[PDB]
Every structure is written in C-alpha cells, then in structure tokens.
C-alpha cells in the first residue's frame, strides 16, 4: 500500500517530512489499545485527552495524553511505594 508513510498518509504532502514523522509516533500510540490493569484485556481505548476507558471491563482510568501510562507517571508510582514502605517500617 505505502512504502513508509503508514498512518500519516492522510496528511498528503503538505506538512513537512519531519513534522509528519513526529505526529506519526504519537498518532499510532494514541489510537492503539492497551492492556487494562484490572482485567488484563487489550480493551482500553482513549475517550479524551487523559481519559481511558476499558471497553470490556467497565472502568475509567486517568492516564497520559496519548499513552495509558507515561514514563514519568510510572517512576513516580514506583517512588511512592518505596517511600511508603520505608515510612511504614520504622
């Protein structure tokens, strides 16, 4: 179908090769389904910027703008768990 322009072929030829490259990575990750942390199904789809809904599970999760869990949002969750255990133990 296309050599390399997969999802950004809808932009035609009118935004710049670099900008169409950057927007491609975001638009793929924004439209893909993610593994839903409470029922382990590939059924989470984005409904708005920062709101994700498990289709076959009935849960609404707050996440990143385009990805369900951001890199900065995962390290923070890990950091708090370490802090909480240390506080709870002496």
Partner 1 sequence: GRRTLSQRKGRGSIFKSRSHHKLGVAQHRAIDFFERHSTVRGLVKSIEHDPGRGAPLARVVFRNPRQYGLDKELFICAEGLYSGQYIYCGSKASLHIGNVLPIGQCPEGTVVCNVESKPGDRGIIARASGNYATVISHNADNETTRIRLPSGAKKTLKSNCRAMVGIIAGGGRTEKPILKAGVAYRMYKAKRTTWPRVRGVAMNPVDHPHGGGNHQHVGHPTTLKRSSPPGQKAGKVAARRTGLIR
Site for partner 1, rule CB under 8 A: 11, 15, 19, 22-23, 26, 38, 48-51, 59-67, 69-70, 72-73, 76-77, 79-80, 83-84, 86-87
Q: Give 51's strand partners.
A: 48, 62
Q: What are phi and psi of 51, to 5 degrees?
A: -125, 125
Binding mask 17-46 for RNA (x = CB under 7 A): xxxx------x--xx------xxxx-x---
What is the token pair recorded at 75? 């390290």
Q: Closest distance between RNA and the C-beta of residue 37, in Å?
A: 10
Binding mask 52-71 for RNA (x = CB under 7 A): ---xxx-------x------
Cα separation of 27 and 72, whole Å?
A: 20
Q: Which residues, other chains included, contact 6 with Cβ-Cβ below 8 Å and sequence gap of 6+?
A: 24, 28
């Amino acid at each position: 179908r296309t050599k390399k322009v997969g999802i950004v072929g809808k932009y035609g030829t009118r935004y710049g090769a670099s900008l169409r490259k950057v927007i491609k990575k975001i638009e793929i990750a924004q439209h893909s389904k993610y593994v839903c942390p409470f029922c382990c199904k590939e059924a989470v789809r984005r409904t708005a910027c920062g709101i994700w809904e498990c289709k076959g599970c009935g849960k609404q999760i707050a996440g990143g703008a385009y990805t369900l869990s951001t890199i900065s949002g995962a390290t923070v969750r890990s950091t708090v768990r370490r802090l909480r255990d240390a506080k709870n133990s002496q």
